[PDB]
Symmetry: D2
Subunit: 249 residues, 4 copies
């Protein structure tokens, strides 16, 4: 198929966008490795995906986990063709009530972990490999009480610009998918643990999208799969925004 | 079989990016209509493409030609699923030597014709159709003696932002592919008609690209096909830039 | 003080932002020339402002008007230090109801006239002169039924990027002020001719602004004066957006 | 004396842009507090600046220093009208050779310290106060071996977008000055410690600027003073780029 003969890694691939992307990449022929912190959900995801998908329990914020994750790839597949640095998250905190670890937590996972996931992956990635960073429209817009999340995603987008030049000798292109609001557990949890709070939040966020609906995670995965394929061969350092129009308007 | 059962129109599909795009769309199963001003080159492209591609001689800057083009589609295919407003061009003119004709010619084909191609197409386009405008990194960068071309391409990008909202009810999404330097007769012709000049310019423009090469026209076409397919269902008003890094760096 | 001795031209300086800007430039010591199509409103603006402001009846869309205007400046003041290509406007037209005259009128005044205002100005402008284009947040956002106006303002913004390079040897910098919603006759007229309609539209546009009010034209004038001053000596090709948060959030 | 009666704080005001800005703010009537880690350079800056400038030795990355800094302001001046988060820096590190310490150092001073400088200042800032974050064109461009610095500055720009909304009720506006290459010790040090190497780098970076020169730190300062004044009353969440054209082309 389109991505057949390609080895893809998705950090945080047991839920939400990571899971849908792993599903889509596998359905295009890739051998897929997914990661996640919780063993139970990791195993359930790997079973649901079938298709020679492979799981590793690993935390992207722990340098040693990253090392172990990639040695597993060197020993098994021997190379990495596609890298989707999906693992990320965010919470609400207005200016005036931002705690030091609200900052550290967001930036360690959303930014620092991306830098080192990419850096440790490089020895496994051949000429023509494709790296997809996970950004967000939050990186180029303003949302009340999400400055730190926004700042973290803008940092992600900027890294890809400079990495064009750092990876040019290596022949590896780096692009960013920036989703708008996507129906995931992640997003819903911003509504709290109440079903009504999640439902209310999800319905409010759908009303902000010009086309008036949230994305299904499979609609984000399609963008990643395109960037993973050789069809994106002349795209480098670019931000592809799939937001139903929200940030372009 | 991605665009199977889809009717696609490419204005200016007899050379360069339009031709490659028509080939690629068609290689996905699409029924393709191409246009062009010169009958010979049009006939020549239609024969080379085979595949139930159909040609119409029409100038996008002529209102009556547009009317005739779309009557032809109404009479034959009966609908339009994919629209690529590819017809466009540009020439060099520094500020201080910009003629009124230089301005009118650029903006009439690159901007005005796009507005009226889209508007005349609308009665043929069902819920879920996809429009692709042809932009350029020139629209978001500065290039000496190309102000008028740049301004025109920036205007094209802005149109899609508002058209998200104008076409929300009709369920039609509008996106922009913004190529960097793609080898094409158009591009080469900026060097003049001599072999020395075309080769020099083409090699100069390749040295500006971080990955160090011009785009093959097919590399742009793959983006349009992605935008044309249902994979792009949550992309609206977005600019997808395929420039090898040049405008992102 | 800051503009003491400087000769400034404001096209379309008989109302709104142009008028307020002419006032502010004069209050900073500049000799200001304002223009307008209507003699009565021109005469009243010149009289109301006093402060050594001078009026010329001229249409920016008429080449011969542009020539006579600049001949007036050569014979009277002998040079031009500051150019504010303010004269502009817009009207509503959804995609599906855009007339050729709606397109031509918008782009002739908003884009073409800017190009040729600047080009005819260049022989009067010394090293270190300052050009200010009037853009708009509509150029980087989407607004239902204002696609053509938006497109024209995006084109203005792009022009400045290329003109940095066209004007480098002449030492003339070019920047763009992009106002958000500003309380002018221009803006009110979008509400119709009834006072009720103007109040409704104006309060609606104010609710779109993060800080919750429209700009007074003097607040846009301050930005132009800053760009006109020598303080902007390291600003070139830039867009300064004064919108109360609306396009930045 | 646009800033007469206004209390301004400039973090990292003993050299370069911070020092020039403190000088310019002071020259407009402001009571200026500057900070710095080194006592000798701080003392020298206060003596050279005179004009009712006040110095405090404090590290923006140490929470306790910030607390002491702002208590001194509460006890002495009793309010803060203008905040310039200037203290910042960066060094080169290509992808493949980025250390955890290089990442932490850049992001702790350039981003984290900015967040908490702003947050601790807020109780001292009245309605109508003005915050200026110090960005960089690096935040929106690609530079080989400067991915981490670039990422940090894009994060800074992003922070202001959301802080528009967080600070609405408070009536405090937040904008970003983004310098291009500006002749500071900071920039020079990127050439190393030898005079030859610093001179070489400074001339190379001057050749990257369209207008062919580095900025004097006073040229950046004028932008900050403008944002600090009431002239910027309708500017909020905006990025003012003073780059001689480099990131606009
Ligand atoms: N959903 C949206 O609307 C949206 C919009 C824009 C951007 N994004 C971005 O898209 C990405 C995915 O978001 P999502 O909504 O799909 O999130 P999600 O459903 O909440 O979680 C996705 C996955 O991330 C894993 N994960 C979390 N922290 C991890 C860590 N430190 N190491 C490894 N795996 C980790 C989770 O498994 P464990 O918890 O077991 O580790 C889970 O499998 C994030 O970068 C997010 O910021 C989302
Ligand atoms: N090539 C690049 O590097 C590059 C980069 C960015 C953007 N673009 C844009 O991509 C588009 C295609 O460029 P290209 O380089 O492929 O151009 P091209 O090879 O020079 O010509 C493209 C096609 O446009 C047709 N055409 C021209 N004027 C027309 C008109 N008035 N009505 C109908 N058809 C017309 C031409 O046929 P006839 O002459 O027979 O009419 C030809 O088939 C243009 O919008 C261009 O600005 C190109
Ligand atoms: N107001 C806003 O919220 C806003 C926002 C963003 C951008 N802008 C831009 O700012 C500029 C001023 O807008 P405004 O609201 O102040 O407009 P306005 O109140 O309608 O005043 C515009 C001025 O332009 C003059 N003018 C119009 N067409 C002209 C022509 N062809 N030649 C010479 N002078 C001409 C008009 O005088 P005559 O009619 O007598 O010729 C009048 O003095 C425009 O470019 C507009 O697009 C405005
Ligand atoms: N120069 C450029 O071309 C350029 C371009 C874009 C952006 N910028 C940004 O502009 C700002 C100023 O840069 P610059 O070139 O003027 O820098 P600089 O000359 O290298 O130093 C600026 C000042 O920052 C102080 N400082 C450094 N670390 C500090 C800390 N942790 N806490 C408090 N004060 C601290 C220094 O004093 P001590 O060492 O004594 O603490 C010094 O007085 C930075 O944010 C920089 O990233 C500069």
């Amino acid at each position: 198929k389109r991505l057949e003969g390609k080895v893809a890694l998705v950090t945080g691939g047991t839920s939400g966008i990571g899971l849908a992307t792993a599903k889509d990449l596998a359905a295009q022929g890739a051998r897929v490795i997914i990661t996640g912190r919780r063993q139970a959900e990791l195993d359930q995801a790997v079973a649901a995906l079938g298709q020679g998908v492979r799981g590793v329990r690993s935390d992207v914020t722990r340098s040693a986990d990253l090392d172990a994750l990639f040695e597993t790839i060197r020993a098994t597949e021997g190379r990495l063709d596609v890298l989707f640095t999906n693992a990320g998250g965010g919470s609400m905190a207005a200016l005036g009530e931002i705690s030091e670890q609200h900052f550290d937590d967001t930036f360690e996972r959303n930014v620092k972990a991306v830098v080192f996931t990419v850096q440790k992956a490089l020895p496994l990635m051949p000429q023509g490999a494709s790296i997809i960073l996970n950004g967000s429209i939050a990186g180029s817009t303003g949302t009340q009480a999400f400055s730190i999340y926004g700042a973290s995603k803008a940092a992600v987008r900027a890294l890809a610009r400079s990495w064009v030049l750092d990876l040019k000798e290596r022949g590896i292109r780096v692009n960013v998918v920036s989703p708008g609001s996507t129906r995931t557990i992640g997003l819903a949890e911003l509504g709290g643990d109440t079903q009504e709070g999640q439902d209310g939040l999800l319905a409010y966020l759908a009303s902000l999208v010009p086309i008036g609906r949230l994305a299904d995670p499979s609609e984000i995965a399609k963008v990643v799969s395109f960037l993973a394929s050789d069809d994106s061969s002349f795209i480098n350092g670019a931000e592809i925004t799939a937001d139903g129009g929200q940030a372009q308007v």
